[PDB]
């Protein structure tokens, strides 16, 4: 109740370890580790995370999935093998108290699929040790969906090593930027399914490479139509207007907007609706994120988002490193 | 000797048990399978007694 429902993902884990840690030693020393008092401590702790004072019962499995996203976040570099390995051991003990295992599985499925497509995977060992702790506690049936998602990413990793060797076999007008980022998805193992998007136009820079991926994937499976997901896939850009050529990994939705600036310095709202080739409901959320940053700046004194307002292009962008993640 | 326990137990149960009791005692039990595998001449007696092959099971007895 000291934090009500605004609990932090790094503070909720330490709050449980401090309460349980001060009681796991008072019983094993004074009471000589009696089995009667040990069962009462685990039974009473299960009702704390399930029946609390604030009216926020669904926030317990959400904070548990958010804690794994911070340890697996890849901003630019990485982490050591001592603090991450020691924090994963104390995480399986807190999960034994929360009885809402069905809500945690739905939150972890959509979070793991987003960290792989966006490229936010920092340590591969954090994903292997996570599915192993859930199998030893819950069982092999509950961790069956998580094991299929990890094995599917390992198959695409082995395919990237074979496609990388093809560059040394007659290839000189292909090497330019980043290499393959194949993320094989399924219909039952993965939460994302083959659903119609919003008939995107696809920028002219992304016309190649992806075209060769459809013909390469058609050789392994006899007839397999693939659909792209522009909501989780991100690209990259190179700005040569500052003192250092910075690279910012932007979303593929912003690439179609920046491609329209090659004809004129400014692009109105009526011309941006035809270049993106989509509805106005999706362009509103896209132009909103570009206005808060230093990518698209307004003119005059104070210009809001309107149907007749223009949108200029700003060369100065807030950067500091190369290939920085925005999610 | 270990080559005589299969004959001592194989010939005693062949006279007191029928064909259905042999498939559940000297066949279903995995402990007696190791003793019958050493001497193949004793394992063929149980198989010939279950397939109603009394003609070939008698010639191998003498």
């Amino acid at each position: 109740s000291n934090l009500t429902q605004e609990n932090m993902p790094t503070l909720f884990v330490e709050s449980v370890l401090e309460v349980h840690g001060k009681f796991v030693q008072l019983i094993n020393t004074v009471l000589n580790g009696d089995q009667h008092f040990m069962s009462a401590l685990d039974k009473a702790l299960t009702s704390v995370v399930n029946y609390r004072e604030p009216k926020s019962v669904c926030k317990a499995p959400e904070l548990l999935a958010k804690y794994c996203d911070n340890l697996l976040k890849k901003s630019a570099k990485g982490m050591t093998e001592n603090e991450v390995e020691d924090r994963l051991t104390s995480f399986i003990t807190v999960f034994k108290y929360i009885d809402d295992k069905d809500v945690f599985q739905k939150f972890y499925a959509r979070m793991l699929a987003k960290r792989l497509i966006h490229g936010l995977s920092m340590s591969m060992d954090s994903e292997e040790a996570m599915i192993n702790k859930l199998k030893q506690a819950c069982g092999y049936e509950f961790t069956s969906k998580l094991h299929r998602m990890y094995t599917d990413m390992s198959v695409s990793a082995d395919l990237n090593n074979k496609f990388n060797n093809f560059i040394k076999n007659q290839d000189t007008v292909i090497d330019l930027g980043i290499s393959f980022q194949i993320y094989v998805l399924q219909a039952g193992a993965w939460p994302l399914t083959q659903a119609p998007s919003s008939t995107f136009a696809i920028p002219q820079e992304l016309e190649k490479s992806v075209q060769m991926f459809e013909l390469f994937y058609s050789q392994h499976f006899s007839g397999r139509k693939l659909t792209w997901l522009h909501y989780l896939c991100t690209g990259e850009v190179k700005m040569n207007y500052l003192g250092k050529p910075y690279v910012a990994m932007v979303t593929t939705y912003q690439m179609a907007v920046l491609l329209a600036f090659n004809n004129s310095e400014t692009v109105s709202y009526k011309e941006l609706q035809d270049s993106t080739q989509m509805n106005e409901k999706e362009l509103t959320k896209t132009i909103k994120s570009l206005l808060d940053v230093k990518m698209i700046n307004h003119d005059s004194e104070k210009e809001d988002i309107d149907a007749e307002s223009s949108f200029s292009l700003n060369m100065n962008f807030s950067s500091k490193r190369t290939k920085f993640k925005i999610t | 000797s270990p080559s005589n326990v299969a004959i001592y137990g194989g010939l005693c149960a062949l006279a007191t048990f029928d064909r259905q009791e042999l498939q559940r005692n000297v066949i279903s039990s995995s402990s007696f399978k190791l003793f019958l595998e050493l001497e193949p001449q004793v394992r063929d007696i149980i198989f010939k007694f279950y397939e109603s092959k009394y003609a070939s099971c008698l010639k191998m007895l003498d």
Partner: protein
Amino acid sequence: MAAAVRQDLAQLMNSSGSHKDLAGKYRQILEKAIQLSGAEQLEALKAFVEAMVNENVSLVISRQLLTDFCTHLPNLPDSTAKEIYHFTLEKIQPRVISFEEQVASIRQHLASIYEKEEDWRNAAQVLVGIPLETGQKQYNVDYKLETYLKIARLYLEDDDPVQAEAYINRASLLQNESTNEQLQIHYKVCYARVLDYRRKFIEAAQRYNELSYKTIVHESERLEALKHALHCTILASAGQQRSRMLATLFKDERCQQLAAYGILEKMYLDRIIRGNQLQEFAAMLMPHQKATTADGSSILDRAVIEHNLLSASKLYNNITFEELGALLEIPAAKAEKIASQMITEGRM
């Protein structure tokens, strides 16, 4: 004239400045290719397809140009538009995920050509490849309902009830949004006919009987559904489920209006079946209900023999194998195999 056409398309390939300026100059080039005739028309129209599949031209300009290009194609004769549809689908094949709206537009006109040339199997395979369920762009409800209705109609005329009733289930999901109650009745009637094609007259007699007691079914369709259930009960084999279905139709007063009251009365009272009773009932049966079943040329030739053996188990004391076959016009080798199968199944 085809030499100057390809030179004008390559100049505007990398040129980009406006949306209406690029689409305005490209429309004048495609207009001149339509007015051409002879061998110069085929070479000019094929150059426009290769100019749109490149990565230099924007997808917005290529989509707007391909939309109006598919409108003037049906105006051309079938001897010229046929070679264009087969050549355009091969160029956009590697980029089928980008121009999904243009692929279905070409396949919609290609299937109409095979329909006019009396080809039901060829026109049905064209609409199948259209990404209706595994596509990135969803069309309207009227566009999907018309496409699914043409596939089931072409497969039905080609003598294929399996492929015709397979694609009709996809259109049933969008039929709930409309208020057409007549289309929902035919959705379950057509499925009941496929179940009867597998020689399952016992199970089909219960589906047609339960559908006649509903309220959404029209009065003209409830009487026709009871006639199919009465015919399936006679064509079914003699057993325990046949006696329960014959007594249910006799208690209903709706069976008196049909002309098949004499067949139901002679089958419920365990009466005799002569050679003139099976011929009158076979004339009122559907053409898809008479198959080559050993003797005769109808399915009723087997149900009559099985029905006479069940009635003889409680009336005839003991008859020889030579006398039992002469009363049914069947050899002695057939009267023994049929009677032996009824005792094992527990029906005689």
